């Protein structure tokens, strides 16, 4: 699993803007989504991403695992992720 090779990232402070060069679609991510995206850029696997989120936010692990699962799936549906 990895970020698609056709995607370019724009970092504006806390948030991230994504552009897909093939589909020509662009996206914005909120604070938590961008944190996850940064970890994906660093090549972190989901388990490591879950660890990072739980260490920085006041939240139970099952909630994080469930939300991450939904989030990655949403990314993949927009072809922002591949091999997921």
């Amino acid at each position: 699993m990895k970020i698609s090779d056709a995607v370019v990232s724009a970092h504006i402070d806390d948030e991230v803007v994504l552009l897909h060069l093939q589909t020509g679609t662009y996206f914005g991510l909120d604070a938590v989504g961008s944190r996850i995206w940064s970890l994906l850029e660093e090549g972190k696997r989901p388990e490591e991403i879950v660890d990072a989120i739980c260490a920085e936010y006041s939240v139970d692990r099952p909630t994080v695992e469930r939300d991450l699962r939904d989030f990655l799936r949403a990314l993949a549906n927009k072809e922002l992720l591949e091999g997921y």
């Binding site: 662009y26 991510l29 909120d30 936010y57 939300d67 927009k78 922002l80």
Partner: peptide
């Protein structure tokens, strides 16, 4: 280590 959590969101804002 104690930030307020909200579920990650992907928002599509447009296209070429």
């Amino acid at each position: 280590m104690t930030k307020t959590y909200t579920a990650p969101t992907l928002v599509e804002y447009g296209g070429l």
